[PDB]
Structures are given as C-alpha cells and as structure tokens.
Amino acid sequence: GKLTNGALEASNVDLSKELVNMIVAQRNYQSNAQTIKTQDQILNTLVNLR
Amino acid sequence: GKLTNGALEASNVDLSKELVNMIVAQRNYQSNAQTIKTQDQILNTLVNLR
Amino acid sequence: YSNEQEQVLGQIVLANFANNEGLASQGDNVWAATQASGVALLGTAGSGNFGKLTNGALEASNVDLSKELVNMIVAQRNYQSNAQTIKTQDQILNTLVNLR
Amino acid sequence: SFSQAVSGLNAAATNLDVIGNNIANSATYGFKSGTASFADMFAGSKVGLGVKVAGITQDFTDGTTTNTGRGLDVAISQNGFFRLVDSNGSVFYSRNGQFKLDENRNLVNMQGMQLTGYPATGTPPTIQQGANPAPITIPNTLMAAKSTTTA
Amino acid sequence: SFSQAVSGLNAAATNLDVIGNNIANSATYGFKSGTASFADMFAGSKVGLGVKVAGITQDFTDGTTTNTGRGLDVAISQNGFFRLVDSNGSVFYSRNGQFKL
Amino acid sequence: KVAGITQDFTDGTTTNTGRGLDVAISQNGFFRLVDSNGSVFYSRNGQFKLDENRNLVNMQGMQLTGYPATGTPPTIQQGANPAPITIPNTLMAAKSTTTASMQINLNSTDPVPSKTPFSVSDADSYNKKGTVTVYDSQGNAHDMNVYFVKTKDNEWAVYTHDSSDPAATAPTTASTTLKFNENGILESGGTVNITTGTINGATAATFSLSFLNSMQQNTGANNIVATNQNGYKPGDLVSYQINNDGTVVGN
Amino acid sequence: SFSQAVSGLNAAATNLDVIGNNIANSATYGFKSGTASFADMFAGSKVGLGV
Amino acid sequence: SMQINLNSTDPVPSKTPFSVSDADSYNKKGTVTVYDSQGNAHDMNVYFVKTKDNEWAVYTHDSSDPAATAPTTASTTLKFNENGILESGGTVNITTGTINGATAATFSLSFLNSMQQNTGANNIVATNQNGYKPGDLVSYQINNDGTVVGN
C-alpha cells in the first residue's frame, strides 16, 4: 500500500446503488411469487376438473 | 465451532419454502381425494347393475 | 509492474460455433459443445465472427420479465382450456355411458 | 379423445416451467432466456392428434451491459463464448464474466472453473497464437531485467 | 414446476439481506461491501431448475479516506491489509485503523 | 356424413420476436422444406435454425430449400430449381479491380505548376494529388496515387503511381490527359486501362480507370467528390440477414 | 389478445429506457438525444395487431 | 482433411533452418487428432513454413509418439496460383507412429479448397477425420424409417 496517518477509510458502499438494487431484488422476488401462485392455480384447475 | 456471546440462533425454517410445500402437499392430497372419488363411483356402477 | 513496464500474460480466447442453439447447457452458467452444436472454432476479440469485449462491465441477463409475465398468463389460460376440453370429453363420455 | 388435451397440458406445463426458470434466472449474469417450440401431431386420420414440444431453445440476443467498477468482470457483446475448463480437464463454454483469482493465481470463475487463453512466452512475451489454449496464470513472477540495447 | 420459482425467491431473499447488510453496514469505517452472485442449475432435461447462489463475494476497491483529527487513524489507500493477533495467538487481517491504545 | 376437415388459411397475428433467424410470412404463401428422405414438404413455421453443416433447417432438422446464389456476382440460374441453402464460413475471396472511377472538380483559376518536369517528390509539379486503393488478382492493397497537372487552358495531365510498389518507378511518361470543352464538361481522355504494380507473388491489377462526371470548377479547390471500385480484401464472415423479400445476405 | 398488449408493452419499455438513457447522459459532452420511432403492425386481417 | 486459409503476406520465418520446438521456425502450427487400429489418439502437428511467394513447405510431426524422429524432409508442399487456388501437393499420404504396442496409422491428408488470404493470419477453417475412439453405449434410438440405431 501507501499509508496515511490522519485519514481513516470509509465504507465501500455507494448506497444509491444498494438502494436501487433492493428494488430490483424486491420486484424479481414478487415475480417469482407470481409464478408460484400461477403454478398453484394451474394445479388447482388440474385437480378440480373431475 | 465458534460460539458467540449475545446473539441467539434463529430458526431454520425459511417460511417461503414451507408455504410452497404446503401448496404442493395439499394439491396432491386433493388428487388422492379424486382417486378415492373415482373408486367410489366405479363401485356404485358395479353395484347398481340389477 | 513496479518498474512501470507491462508484459502480456495471455489473451482470453473466445469461441464460436456452427449454431448457438445446439449448445447443451450444463449445470451452471456453462454451456457445452455437442454434435448438434458443431465443434467450436476459436479465436480472439474482434476477428471476423467474434465478439467485441469489455473490461469491467458485466453482462446482465437477457430476460424481460414483462414478456415473461405476459407469457405465463397465456400459458396459464390455454392450460385451463386444455383442462376444459378433457372436462367436456369426460362429460360426453359420462352421458355416453349411462344413456342405456 | 383425451390425447390432444393431455398433450396440451404437458405442453403448457413445460412452457410454464421454462418461463418460471427464466423469471427465476433474472439478474444472474450471463443467463440466456428460455424458449419453447411446439409442433402438432398427425397421422393418416384427417383430424389432429395434439401437440408435442419440438424442443427447448435459448434466446441468443445480447443482454444489457452493466458497468461495474470491478476490473475482473470481463464481459463480451457479440457471438463469442468464453472457453472454460474444469478440474477434470473438460472444456466448457460460458458468458458469465464474474472472475475470481484462486490461490494459485489463475483466472477462475466464481465456481472455480479455470479460463483458457493463448499463452504468452518470451521476453517480452507476445501472443503465442498457435491455436493451443491454456489456463491463464497471472502470477507474481518477477519482471526479469534485461539489457539496454538501443539507447 | 414450482422449485424453480422458490429458488428464485430465496435467491432474491439472499440479494435482499446482503443488500440490507450493506445498507445497515453503511458509514462504518473499513467495511468492504458484499455482493451476491448467482448461477442457473440444469440437468439432463433442457428445461430448468432455478437459480442458486454462486457465492457472496466482496468488492475490494478502496473506500474514500476521510480526514479525521485523531492521530491514530491509519488507513491503506491501496491493496494492503493490516495484521492482528489476539489473546489466542491467531492471525487476523483488517482494513480500518481505529487504533486505540 | 362428415364431409371433411378443412383448414382455414387466414394469417395469424405476426409477433415481433427479437431473434434474427425467425422469418415468417403473413399471406397465402408456403415455406418449402425437405427432409433427409428426399421428399419435399411445405410449411409455414418461422423457427429456422441451422445445423452443424450450417444449412438452414426448421426445428425438426428439415432443410429449407431455396433458389441458389450462383455466379460472381452470385445470382439465380436458368434451370429454376431450388436447393438446400447454406451459410458457409468459406471466406469471400477477393477479385482484381476492374472498374475504378474517380470524379474530380478542379478550379479553372489554378495556375500552371511551376517546377517542371514532373516529380512525385515535388508538390509544386502537380496541382492535385488523389488516392484510390485498388486490389489485384490475389487482392492486396495498392494505394494508386493519381496526379493532376494543368498544362494549359482546360487541359490537365493525369499521372498514375503505385505507392504500394517499392519496385515501381516514378511516372514520367504521360498516363492520360483530361481535355475539357469550353463549358467545363469532359470531352475526351476520361478512361484508361491502367496496370498496377506487382507485389509479393501477387500479379498486378489491370483495371479500367474512369474520370466520367468530372467537371472543371471556376473558383474553388481541386476536389475529389466520388471514388468507387470493385476491388476488396478477403472478408471471412461477420453476420447475415434474411432480407425482407426473402433472400439471405451475408455481411 | 395478448399480442397487441405485449407489442405495446415492449414499445413503452424501450421508449422508457431510451429516454432514461437521455436523462442519464444529460450534460455529458457531445451526447445526442435519442427518440424511439414506432410503427404499427398489420397483416391480412383488417383489424390491427400491434406496434 | 485440414482446410486452412493462408496469409500471403507472412514473411519467410527468421529462424532458419526448420525447428520443431522453436516457434519462430515456422509460420503456423496446427493440430489434427487421428486414430489408429488400436484406438489411441495421435496428435499430428502440421507445421507451415513459407518458402517463397505462393508455396509453403508443409512438415508433419507425430507429437503423441515421443520416440519419433524430428522431420527434416518435406511432408508436402502447398503450391498456389495468383488467384489463391491450390495447385499441387494438396493431398498426401502419411504414416503415423506406434505407441503402447499399437499399429501404425496411415491416412490421406487433404488440403482441398485451401485459399491464400491476402491480409490476416493463418487460421484453420475445417478439419475432419474418420478415426474415432471406442465407445460402449450412451443412447439408442428407433428412427422413423424402421432403422434402429445406437449412439
């Protein structure tokens, strides 16, 4: 490295990118919820046909 | 392994995986209900010959 | 390096195929070549049929979940219509049996 | 009678499985989209006999490209493929550029499969493009000093 | 049919809690962020199996060194790590210099 | 009595698919296919892949049949019989330049070049330097410098020199001469069968250079507006398209 | 049906990401604005079928 | 057969005479894997050197036979015209070596439709050979023409 004595290192996060990445995680979580609920209701009509 | 001080060990269950497992368990329960249903009505079409 | 001269340590080989569609995808982001894929011809970035590369930028997935979300409901509704044609096949056989 | 619609149910079930895979594989880098391909059965009978899945294919467009400051995230945008090798020496191909170093300082992906490159031999090395790929070792090997010839 | 989507669910949950870590871990000194990385599973079938974590890998670019009036506040602005031993003699490596006496 | 099961042949909704090799018609036409059995079949599906032999097939491997690309330039033949069409990685071979033309607009107010006789190392011996990059029978680069020298009123000496040939000599004998009318329109001298140099076992290009559509400006600069030729480099392959009227083109 | 809707839905998606690119490259020197020009779909049926 | 496009502007290599181990003694190295009557893989390295304009000394080496002699004679010579059309020496018979008590494989190597590229590098277009490993079984299929097959 090359050390400095007065200055102390802050974090590595750029929390704009984290706060916009949690939204993409939220929405593809919700779309995965959409496909489990649609496999639920196709299996629902696969039962109740008689 | 590395025991910790004040943190508790929270539960193993990830409740999304169980909320889809109850869906698939209840719908093949319903499929088993349909095969006892068809066994019921093939038995009464075996009975009501005479 | 520390004397500020650089030396080449290798070059990332790219590979193309006869068709991309014959690639049998293995159990990762990995694909694997087949008889159906054609044997892979190899080269570097920018020569003929080959890929212009980037340095730090990473390639995201190509799925558009708007088209995925609108395809799941059309697969869902024609699934239910297939359920209803076996349903009415059941009803016409039911009134075919017990007519006497 | 029933064969048409049980074929249709199997077709829509494979279709839903493919697109549920595609929704699940959103935002995994290098994933290419799934697509189903269907075709109808026939025979000597003039009526139709359902639908078979003629095959599952991929969609080979380019994804969008996200600029990450990490320098070991090399991606490509055209028809090429990274040529990886595993621990068993089997050749594979991929487009996920999330590349680690391992202990031995040769470029693995985040699974551990090593890249392949045309090696560079000499002093100073050039592209020894003899069509012979090899895992890209990027060592801490010292820069061997050479003599001045033209000042 | 269903396992692909619950694989997508817990993959997005792994995204969401490592991002909630990094947001909760924001503006501490000498933390270096985490990053979830994924990969698709496949089998003999050409249809899919969902998504798993390939791993939680950290980014090792430098945080912005902030001026602080305390003198015991060293920080590397490059690719070195500190070295720490404990009361049990095990080696450990750090990046912040919150160095009290 | 069931009289028979009829198809209906109205076109379905054409769906915009971002894939490239997915061509589907919307009229009463029919794609033509063949399988390996040798029987010709007719379809309408747009899913078109290519094999490991890189001939365009459907999803079931049945090869598309099309009108061939025969000749140089590749065109249709007078037997009119379709065939399985391929997309090869066989490289586009170069052919010698045969027709090159350069159009020039020279000011008529330009004085006669002073430093006579002509030299290629003397800028004041000519009025205008131009460049046309032609390619020979094997097809390597030849940067033919053409040279424009005002001899007198409306008459322009035109010199040719292969800069790519280190074994060539300087032009000192006249290649041709543009002679213009009173109106500034080219009268004669607007064509020459000019031969390039010979380099590294590739024999020289012997091409028709033309200066048609040139005209003498009255005040301005000596300006080349349009060069064109039919010589080129060996291109291997980059990409390909299905054109909108059916044919396939290869970049 | 769903075809006009998906065609339409995409049109708006590509228009949104192009004008997001125009907002993102604001005050980047020498950048040029981009507009997504669209065009409607027709076939042998009299009713329109997308964009 | 090995079909390959040859750079016409490649110089005569500076390392003279020929060497099998030294990279600058040849214009381009290529590899074809051939197979014998026993079934072992022989990695035939083809070495392209240019002699003068429009013809190439083609030397062959059996690198999978470690007890093999280094070639100092011409395996063949690729002769080209002014248009890059192959002229003569485009098909040559060649014997391989033996190892592990196997039999020697002798095959006809074909360079047909090899073109001489003006500007570029030497790149292998298409190789194909009819030798193959032993194979036990993976699949077996009932094709529609009443023909049963194994793969």
One DSSP character per residue, D42-84 reads --SSSS---EEEEEEEE--SPPPEEE-S-SS--EE-SS--EEE
Is the CB of residue F19 less than 8 Å away from at least one CB of chain D?
Answer: yes
Task: Output the CA–CA distances (angstroms, integers) from residue H104 to B37, H39, H71, H94, H130, in the order listed.
Answer: 72, 11, 17, 10, 15
Nearest to D20 among E5, E39, E54 (CB): E5
Out of F49, F50, F238, name the one closest to residue C49 (CB): F238
**Residue C97 region by backbone torsions, left for phi larger than 0, else alpha for psi between -120 and 50, else beta:** alpha
- Residue F160, SS3? strand
| Rounded-to-integer distance, Cα H114 and Cα H77, Å | 13
Distance CA E100, CA E85 (A): 15
Chains touching chain H at 3 or more Cβ pairs under 8 angstroms?
Answer: C, D, F
> What method did the depositors use to determine the structure?
cryo-EM
What gap in Å lies between CA C67 and CA G12, rounded to an integer? Answer: 12
Is D85 in contact with C40 (CB distance < 8 Å)? no
Other C-beta atoms within 10 Å of H104: how many? 15
Please indicate whether, in this complex, the C-beta atoms of G43 and F16 are within 8 angstroms of each other: no
F16: nearest CA partner in chain G: G7
Look-up of token digits 């999978």: H64
Chains G and E touch (3+ CB pairs under 8 A): no
Interface test with A, best of C2, C72, C92 (most A CBs within 10 A): C72
**If you measure CA to CA, which chain A residue comes closest to C91?**
A50
Measured CA to CA in angstroms, residue F92 lies from F75, F243, H43, H81 at distances of 15, 19, 31, 17
- Say how many CB pairs under 8 Å bridge A and B: 16
In terms of Cα–Cα distance, which of E48, A45, E2 is closest to B18?
A: E2
Q: Starting from the edge strand earliest in sequence, which strands make up the sheet with F176-180, in order?
A: F128-135, F141-152, F155-162, F176-180, F186-188
DSSP state of D127: E
Half-sphere exposure for A25 (CA within 13 Å, toward CB): 21
Encoding tokens for residue C62?
A: 């190509």
Q: What residue of A is the nearest CA neighbor of E31? A: A11
User: Cα-flanking dihedrals φ and ψ of residue D118, to 5°?
Assistant: -75, 120
Show residues of chain E in contact with C25, CB under 8 Å.
40, 42, 46
Residues F219 and F240 reside in one and the same domain? no
Which residue, E20, E28, E24, E33, is CA-closest to E62? E33
Q: Is the dihedral of CA D37, D41, D42, D43 positive or negative?
A: positive
Q: Do D26 and C17 touch (CB under 8 A)?
A: no
Contacts 24+ apart (CB under 8 A), H63-71: H64/H40, H64/H97, H64/H99, H65/H96, H65/H97, H65/H98, H65/H99, H66/H99, H67/H97, H67/H99, H68/H97, H70/H20, H71/H18, H71/H20, H71/H47
Report the residue of chain H nearest D131, measured CA to CA.
Answer: H30
> Which residue type sits at E21?
N
Nearest residue in chain F measured CA to CA from C63:
F18
DSSP 3-state assignment of H110? strand
Using the 8-state DSSP alphabet, how is residue C98 labeled? T
Residue from H86, H32, H40 nearest H60 by CA: H32
How many pairs of residues across A and E have Cβ atoms under 8 Å apart? 131
Identity of the amino acid at E34: G
Nearest CA to D83 among D72, D92, D73?
Answer: D92
Inspect the interface and report whether the beta carbons of F236 and C49 lie closer than 8 Å.
yes
Chain A / chain D CB contacts < 8 angstroms: 21
Q: How many CB atoms lie within 10 A of CB F23?
A: 19
E13 contacts B17? CB cut-off 8 A: no
Contact H124, H27 (CB under 8 A): no
Chain A CB contacts of B24 below 8 Å: 43
* ∠ Cα D107 D113 D133 (to 5°): 65
Beta strands F74-75 and F56-57, pairing class: unpaired
The reply to whether D132 touches chain H by the CB within 8 Å rule is yes
Asked if F35 and D77 count as a contact pair (C-beta separation under 8 A), the reply is no
- What does the angle CA D4 – CA D9 – CA D14 come to, to the nearest 5 degrees? 125
All partners of chain A with 3 or more CB pairs under 8 angstroms: B, C, D, E
Element (H, E) at G5: helix G2-24
Contacts of F33 (CB under 8 A, 6+ apart): F40, F41, F42, F43, F58, F62, F63, F64, F65
Q: Which residues pair with F228 in a beta bridge?
A: F101
d(CA F204, CA F167) in angstroms, rounded, equals 12
- Interhelix angle A15-47/D3-24, rounded to 10 degrees, is 170
Q: What are phi and psi of H127, to 5 degrees?
A: -120, 140
Integer Cα distance of F23 and F43 in angstroms: 12
Token representation of residue D139 = 């060592």
Which residue among D17, D55, D98 sits closest to E48, beta carbon to beta carbon? D17
**Which chain C residues are Cβ-neighbours of A26 within 8 angstroms?**
none
Nearest-by-CA chain B residue for E7: B17
Compare CB distances from A49 to C65, C69, C87 and report the shortest one's residue.
C87
Within this chain, do residues F110 and F228 fall inside the same structural domain, yes or no? Answer: yes
Q: Which residues of B touch A47 (CB under 8 A)?
A: 27, 30-31, 34
* Interaxial angle between packed helices D3-24 and C65-97, expressed in degrees from 0 to 180 and rounded to the nearest 10: 160
The dihedral through the CA atoms of E94, E96, E97, E98 has a sign that is negative
- Looking at beta carbons, which residues of chain D come within 8 Å of C83? 5, 9
Q: How far is residue D68's CA from residue B11's CA, in Å, rounded to a whole number?
A: 35
Q: Do A33 and E79 touch (CB under 8 A)?
A: no
Beta-carbon neighbour count of residue E74 at 10 Å? 19
* Distance (Å) from the alpha carbon of H98 to chain F's nearest alpha carbon: 33
Interface test with F, best of C23, C44, C49 (most F CBs within 10 A): C49
Question: 């249809």: which residue's tokens?
Answer: E47
Phi then psi for C73, rounded to 5 degrees? -80, -25
CA distance H85 to F137: 11
Please answer yes or no on whether G43 and F11 come within 8 Å at the CB atom. yes
Query: Quick one: which of H17, H120, D33, C56 has its CA closest to F237?
Result: H120
- State whether F117 and F148 are in the same domain: yes
The token duo for E54 is 């390939």
Residues contacting residue D150 through CB under 8 Å, at least 6 positions apart: none
Does F45 lie at the interface with D, CB-CB under 8 angstroms? yes
The rounded distance, in Å, linking the Cα atoms of E34 and E19 is 8
Question: Same structural domain for residues F41 and F17?
Answer: yes
Nearest chain E Cα distance for residue A48, angstroms: 19
Query: For strand H116-117 and strand H2-7, is the pairing parallel, antiparallel, or unpaired?
Result: parallel
Name the CA dihedral angle for E57, E60, E63, E69, rounded to a multiple of 10 degrees.
110
> Are H129 and H120 contacting, i.e. CB atoms less than 8 angstroms apart?
no
Expressed as residue numbers, the domain containing F185 is 94-233
Q: Which two tokens stand for residue D4?
A: 């048409």
**What residues of chain G lie within 8 A of the CB of F16, using their CB?**
7, 10, 41, 50
10 Å Cβ neighbour count for F229?
19
Distance from CA of F49 to the nearest CA of C (A): 8
Contact E57, D101 (CB under 8 A): no
CA separation for the pair F182, F215 (Å, rounded): 11
CA–CA distance, E59 with C36 (Å, rounded to integer) = 39
Answer yes or no: do E13 and B23 touch at CB < 8 A: no
CB F249 within 8 A of CB F92: no
Contacts of E52 (CB under 8 A, 6+ apart): E7, E11, E38, E39, E41
Which chains sit next to B, with 3 or more Cβ pairs under 8 A? A, E
CB contact under 8 A, C76 and A31: no
Q: H88: buried, middle or exposed (CB in 10 Å: 19+, 13-18, 0-12)?
A: exposed
CB contact set of F92 (below 8 Å; sequence gap of 6+):
F232, F234, F235, F236, F237
Regarding chains C and A, contact by 3 or more CB pairs under 8 A is answered as yes
CB contact under 8 A, B27 and A47: yes
Q: Are F60 and D54 inside 8 Å of each other by CB?
A: yes
Q: Is F51 on the interface with C (CB under 8 A)?
A: yes
- Judged by a CB distance cut-off of 8 A, whether residue H79 touches chain D is no
- Token readout for H99 is 């190892």
Distances in whole angstroms, Cα of residue F130 to Cα of each of C40, F124, F126, F146, F227? 45, 15, 11, 5, 10
What Rg value do the Cα atoms of chain A yield, rounded? 23
Distance between E100 CA and the closest CA of chain D, angstroms: 33
Cβ <8 Å between D131 and H31 = yes
Q: How many CB atoms lie within 10 A of CB H4?
A: 20
Nearest to A28 among D19, D20, D27 (CB): D27
CA geometry: angle F229, F231, F237, nearest 5 deg: 125
Question: Chain F 75-94, CB below 8 Å of chain H: which residues?
Answer: 89-91, 93-94
B10, two tokens:
């929270």
Supply the angle between the helices B15-47 and E3-24 in degrees, to the nearest 10: 160
Cα dihedral value H89, H91, H97, H101, nearest 10: -160
Asked whether C29 and E40 are in contact (CB, 8 A), the reply is yes
Answer yes or no: do C58 and D65 touch at CB < 8 A: yes
- Which residues share a beta bridge with F161? F145
CB C81 within 8 A of CB A45: no
The values of phi and psi at residue F72, to 5°, are: -140, 95
Q: What is the dihedral of CA D110, D112, D117, D119, to 10 degrees?
A: 120
Chain D interface includes F237 (CB < 8 A): no
Q: Is D38 on the interface with C (CB under 8 A)?
A: no
User: What gap in Å lies between CA G19 and CA D141, rounded to an integer?
Assistant: 49
- State whether residue D118 is helix, strand or coil: strand
Residue D47 at interface with chain F, using a CB cutoff of 8 Å:
yes
Q: What residues of chain C have any CB closer than 8 angstroms to a CB in chain E?
A: 24-29
Q: What are phi and psi of H100, to 5 degrees?
A: 60, 30
Count of CB atoms situated within 10 Å of the CB of F124: 10
- Do H31 and D132 count as a contact with CB atoms less than 8 A apart? yes
Please tell me if residue D61 touches chain F, with a CB cutoff of 8 Å.
Answer: yes
